[PDB]
Design a binder for these strands. Structure first.
Lengths: 310, 307
DNA sequence: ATAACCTAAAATTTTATAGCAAAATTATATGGGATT
DNA sequence: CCCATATAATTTTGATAAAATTTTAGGTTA
């Protein structure tokens, strides 16, 4: 009979969720509890737009305000199933998308970025980690999850069958795909292969660690335990800021561990790699995400291709 | 309460702004409902059992799989509206047709390059159908919808830049007669050399000006423009004559749209670069075009990932 | 004598989707330890 | 400045039918 109580019921309905979801839901539950639109009766469309106006004034980005709306709309979708859905509208009207464009790295930047890492006495230890990302386009947690079992040196193949993440409290835990759709095999090039060989040959001080039958992880922290998402993201934040201070052409504002995946995917799509073959290596279930890396065509473009394949 | 017939009828007025083909498509279902025992059942007393059982009768009656799956959507939206007005609690048509029925739909097989340049050679020689040769080369070289080909006029073409302007389609339905219902296509030399021939060999044009459109490129025997039915019916005769002159017959499902299927496929398997096929085909979503692309395995990626 | 065309009629197919949030990645404040 | 980590914010990612086209039955004509 209130909004805050409503979202609590929607949370108890679909309980089978990962750990990060529970955190993300609590953040929204904290927002509803800290706003006037959280103490009102569900039976009491204009206020939802006003709520969207306040979240924009809080400082939260467009998508952050957008994703939350979808959760509330589902909560009222079930409520109406059990008036009119007050969150049934387009956020594009109330607020504008001030989202930052994730500009990839130009081949000149990468050749200068890697050289900096290699020649930097502080971050040269992560060089082998970065090269593989620009050769496999692995997700950052997929990289941290790799063990000696998931590598095929003889056949040059990376078996991506899991991901290793760590959260506050729960600690380390292994996440796996339900069906065999998640599993994919990524081929190693000479740069990637010889990078893994250096990681294996230079691994030392691995403290005793086993989680759900996984051990001998490749990338470990200085504290003895494997690297996590935060450990690599925070390293990038320091590395890029150090690169920008010594290089005029500062790296893109989105130069994050995921941008290494951006750059990888964008390259192949530009070089004319098979769109479905790219979808596999990327691990996209829906082809739509992969096709976003491909440039929008024109008449001249469509004509050129027709004349190229005539 | 009210029956299903009265609910589907009420859902028809609520959503009126529909084109003629829709009305025809909606009327067929309304005939089915009146014919079926389901149409007389009160909306409230319709259970998931009754909804699934209806799908069985449709197949037993002879209807194809995709036919029953579309009518399922037309009826689901009706109960959905009936559920929105709080007439009833749950929607009986919320289930997968794959569980109750099998998808025995004929696979739409496009023409292989070997079949293509053997099918064209037959048209160019057969006295009865060489008049349509120029038209087919266009359908295969442009990948147009069949009514959109009928719509093409002298004004739509641009021989200077060799581009086709597709902005409309010409339709004909019983009673209404003819009626007109947004992309640009590059014309290859083979398609252009056909287009220049169609105009130079066009005559006996009747007076025809519909919705601001006149001088259609492809005309029937009676001087009036070709329709969708006239081309499909022509293909039913053409294919049957090919199969007698050749041992290895053509695909059973070879139709005007198969000439489009063949174009997109041959383009996709040629590796046509991004979304330019999507632009040349004219799909709203990119997902529709990717269906014309072959499924890739690990081996397909291995060779493609070579650099 | 058989197809070849035509048309009303009944059928099949083509085409259309953001988004009725989860679940990841990234940024930051804090604080201790190694460097310039 | 590096590193680790708790906290928090941002990003990345899972057909509630219209409107066409195809086929077919019946008839005439080449």
């Amino acid at each position: 009979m209130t909004v805050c109580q409503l979202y609590a019921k929607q949370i108890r309905h679909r309980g089978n969720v990962k750990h990060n979801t529970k955190l993300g839901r609590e953040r929204l539950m904290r927002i509803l509890e800290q706003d006037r639109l959280g103490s009102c009766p569900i039976d009491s469309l204009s206020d939802a737009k006003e709520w969207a106006l306040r979240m924009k004034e809080k400082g939260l980005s467009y998508k952050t305000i957008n994703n939350d709306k979808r959760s509330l709309k589902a909560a009222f979708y079930t409520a109406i199933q059990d008036r009119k859905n007050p969150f049934d509208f387009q956020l594009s009207d109330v607020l504008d998308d001030d989202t930052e464009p994730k500009v990839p790295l130009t081949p000149a930047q990468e050749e200068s970025f890697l050289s900096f890492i290699q020649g930097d006495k502080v971050y040269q230890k992560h060089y082998d980690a970065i090269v593989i990302l620009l050769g496999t386009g692995l997700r950052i947690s997929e990289l941290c999850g790799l063990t000696d079992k998931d590598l095929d040196f003889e056949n040059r193949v990376i078996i991506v069958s899991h991901q290793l993440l760590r959260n506050t409290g729960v600690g380390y835990y292994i996440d796996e795909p339900k069906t065999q759709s998640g599993v994919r095999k990524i081929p190693m090039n000479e740069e990637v292969y010889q990078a893994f060989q250096r990681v294996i040959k230079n691994r030392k001080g691995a403290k005793p660690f086993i989680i759900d039958g996984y051990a001998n992880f490749l990338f470990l922290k200085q504290n003895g335990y494997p690297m996590t998402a935060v450990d690599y993201g925070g390293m990038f934040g320091r590395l890029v800021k150090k690169y920008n201070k010594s290089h005029e052409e500062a790296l893109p504002k989105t130069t994050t561990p995921h941008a290494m995946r951006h750059t990888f995917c964008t390259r192949l799509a530009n070089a004319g790699m098979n769109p479905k073959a790219l979808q596999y290596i990327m691990g996209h279930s829906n082809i739509t995400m992969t096709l976003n890396y491909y440039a929008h065509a024109t008449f001249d473009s469509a004509r050129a291709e027709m004349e190229r394949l005539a």
